[PDB]
């Protein structure tokens, strides 16, 4: 017997309550998986689901005490945990799940299988998710004005589209992108459009995650990034002025891993799942404490070169090398965006771009040619090679050059290498990094008399 135990068993047989690996219960209400840390929603689920039970059972669930008894039975019933958020190509809305590969929208038992514990926070509309509309035409004009379709902007616009499209995938991304451009160029407009499109999957944090350490004490700025599809940081503190802390390369490397280590206040959970595209919006180039290949593998840059100005400053801005086009500023555009006018138009654009750029594998690739800091470390790699075994027999002309054969390897001493490099670089501006490279790759081959085991490709190229 025990009517209430029978009710709890019947409710548990529908798989509407689940226990997660973080020790919180997720309930299936209103075509969505919901959970709350301080107020569980099990009684909410019971009261909502009373309509699916026999008449003799439904009238019992109208009493809070009996609902609490059923909740206790269910809590005792749930023993084992389940894994959630395992499908990267599904976009969850408050009333269903959108398939990014097919385009089909699922609700009910079809959307139940994909245990997505996050959502955009608003309902999906099949009527406004169309390709042709005045909203779509306005949005296409705005996008084409922000990033023109000229041949000199093709790769940059493709990178723009790829970065914006990746904000739909629930997986780990391997690059950090920089939206760089001068004032009034559409960067914050793009950010607000994306926020309107993807809703609660979009989060904004501070420069602390880039500048300070991440373990330290409690860090809600890192703890809030759990399972978010897009993270935005803004207003990079230009480091030309003194007192500014440089960006940490280890922070960049840790923000790429699939698990980020950090904890909130009054909590012991120290591991967060990383599903986010991290975008930094700035008008100044970034500088890092140290530069290496690992850092150079994880940075991409998108440029904004269109200025929207009043007629007062049109002539002044038309004589600036920082802009490739000047347009007329729109006054009501920010309010129109705030009213979620282009939400579904931009969603349709994002899904189309996702299909376009998502061949069987979609990956983010770096652009190290856009950062002035990497210039020396790129030119050095273009001018020198490491002395391998395959250069031993040719040591005659190399000894004419100045190379010496020690320990059966060809090497180059201090001063000769210094002047050979100074012939290729500038001593006034490229000094500190030259000394840093010399100290980094220095090797004392014998007792004193240090040397580098590096050969210029020009010496072998031109005998």
Ligand X SMILES: Nc1ncnc2c1ncn2[C@@H]1O[C@H](COP(=O)(O)OP(=O)(O)NP(=O)(O)O)[C@@H](O)[C@H]1O
Binding site for ligand X (CB under 6 A): 142, 145-146, 181, 183-189, 283, 294, 308, 327, 329-330, 333-334
Contact call for residue 405 and its own copies (CB under 8 A): no
Among 311, 360, 393, 463, binds its own copies (CB under 8 A): 360
52 Cβ contact partners less than 8 Å away, ≥ 6 residues apart: 14
CB-nearer residue toward ligand X: 332 or 463: 332
- In this structure, is the dihedral angle defined by the CA atoms of residues 225, 37, 49 and 12, taken in order, positive or negative? positive
Shortest gap between Cβ of 249 and its own copies (angstroms)? 7
From residue 131 to residue 170, the character string flagging contacts with its own copies as x (rule: CB under 8 A) and all else as - is ----------------------------------------
Smallest distance, ligand X to C-beta of residue 71, A = 45
Q: Which of 105, 160, 221, 354 binds its own copies (CB under 8 A)?
A: 221
For residues 11 and 326, which CB has a smaller minimum distance to ligand X in the complex? 326
What SS3 state is found at 202? strand
Minimum CB distance to its own copies smaller for 2 or for 419: 2
Pairing of strands 230-234, 277-282: parallel
Calpha distance 94→200 (Å, rounded): 10
Quick one: what does residue 308 bind among Mg ion, its own copies, ligand X, none, with the CB cut-off 5 to 8 Å set by partner type? Answer: ligand X
CA-based torsion, 77, 81, 85, 87: positive or negative:
negative
Q: Nearest 5°: CA angle at 397, between 393 and 400?
A: 130
Under the criterion CB under 8 A, does residue 13 sit at the interface with its own copies?
no
Binding flags for its own copies, 235-264, as an x/- string (CB under 8 A):
xxxx--x-x----xxx--xx--xxx-x-xx
Per DSSP (E only), the strands in 139-254 are 176-181, 202-204, 230-234
Structure tokens at 298: 């994880």
CA distances to 4, 59, 183, 329 from 313, rounded to whole Å, are: 74, 71, 13, 11
Please list every residue from 130 through 189 that binds Mg ion, using CB under 5 A: 188
Question: Of 109-117, 128-136, 328-336, 350-358, which part binds its own copies (CB under 8 A)?
Answer: 328-336
220 makes contact with its own copies (CB under 8 A): yes
* 113 scored as a contact of its own copies (CB under 8 A): no
Give the number of residues in contact with its own copies, rule: CB under 8 A.
Answer: 103
Choose the contact partner of 361 out of ligand X, Mg ion, its own copies, none; CB within 5 to 8 A by kind: its own copies
* Cβ–Cβ < 8 Å for 261, 267: no
Integer-rounded Cα radius of gyration of the chain: 29
Measured from the Cβ of residue 396, the count of other Cβ atoms closer than 10 Å reads 9
Strand arrangement, sheet containing 277-282:
202-204, 230-234, 277-282, 176-181, 299-304
- Which of ligand X, its own copies, Mg ion, none is residue 358 near (CB under 5 to 8 Å by kind)? none
Task: Draw the binding track, 274-313, toward its own copies (x: CB under 8 A; -: no contact).
Answer: ---------x-----xx-xxx--x----------------
């Amino acid at each position: 017997g025990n009517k209430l135990f029978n009710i709890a068993q019947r409710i548990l047989d529908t798989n509407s309550v689940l226990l997660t690996e973080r020790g919180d219960h997720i309930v299936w209400i209103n075509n969505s998986w919901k959970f709350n840390s301080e107020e569980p929603l099990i009684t909410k689920l019971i009261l909502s689901i009373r309509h699916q039970l026999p008449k003799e059972y439904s009238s019992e669930l109208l009493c809070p005490r009996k609902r609490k008894t059923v909740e206790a039975n269910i809590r005792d019933m749930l023993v084992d945990s389940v894994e959630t958020d395992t499908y990267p190509d599904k976009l969850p809305f408050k009333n269903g799940v959108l398939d990014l590969v097919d385009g089909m929208f699922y609700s009910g038992d079809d959307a139940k299988k994909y245990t997505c514990t996050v959502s955009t926070g608003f309902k999906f509309d099949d009527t406004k998710f169309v390709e042709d509309s005045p909203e779509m035409e306005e949005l296409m004009n705005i996008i084409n004005d922000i990033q023109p379709l000229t041949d000199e902007n093709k790769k940059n616009r493709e990178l723009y589209e790829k970065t914006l499209s990746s904000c739909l995938c629930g997986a780990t991304k391997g690059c950090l992108t920089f939206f760089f451009g001068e004032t009034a160029t559409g960067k914050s407009t793009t950010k607000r459009l994306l926020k309107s499109a993807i809703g609660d999957l979009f989060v904004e944090t501070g420069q602390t995650i880039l500048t300070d350490v991440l373990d330290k004490g409690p860090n809600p700025f890192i703890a809030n990034m759990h399972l978010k599809r897009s993270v935005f940081c803004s207003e990079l503190p230009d480091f030309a002025c003194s007192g500014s802390k440089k960006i940490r390369s280890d922070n960049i490397k840790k923000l790429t891993e699939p698990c980020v280590i950090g904890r909130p206040c009054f909590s012991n959970k120290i591991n967060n799942r990383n599903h986010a595209t991290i975008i930094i919006d700035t008008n100044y180039k970034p500088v890092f404490d140290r530069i290496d290949n690992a850092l150079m593998r994880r940075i991409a840059v998108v440029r904004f070169r269109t200025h929207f100005s009043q007629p007062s400053g049109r002539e002044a801005a038309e004589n600036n090398d920082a802009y490739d086009k000047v347009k007329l500023l729109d006054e009501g555009l920010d309010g129109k965006i705030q009213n979620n006018r282009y939400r579904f138009a931009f969603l349709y654009l994002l899904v189309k771009w996702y299909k376009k750029y998502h061949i069987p594998i979609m990956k983010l690739y770096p652009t190290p040619e856009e950062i002035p800091d990497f210039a020396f470390y790129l030119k050095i790699g273009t001018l020198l090679v490491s002395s391998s075994v395959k250069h031993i027999p040719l040591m005659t002309d190399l000894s004419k050059k100045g190379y010496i054969l020690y320990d059966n390897v060809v090497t180059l001493p201090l001063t000769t290498f210094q002047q050979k490099i100074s012939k290729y670089f500038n001593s006034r501006l490229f000094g500190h990094d030259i000394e840093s490279f010399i100290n980094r790759h220095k090797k004392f081959a014998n007792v004193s008399d240090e040397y580098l085991q590096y050969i210029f490709i020009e010496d072998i190229s031109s005998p």
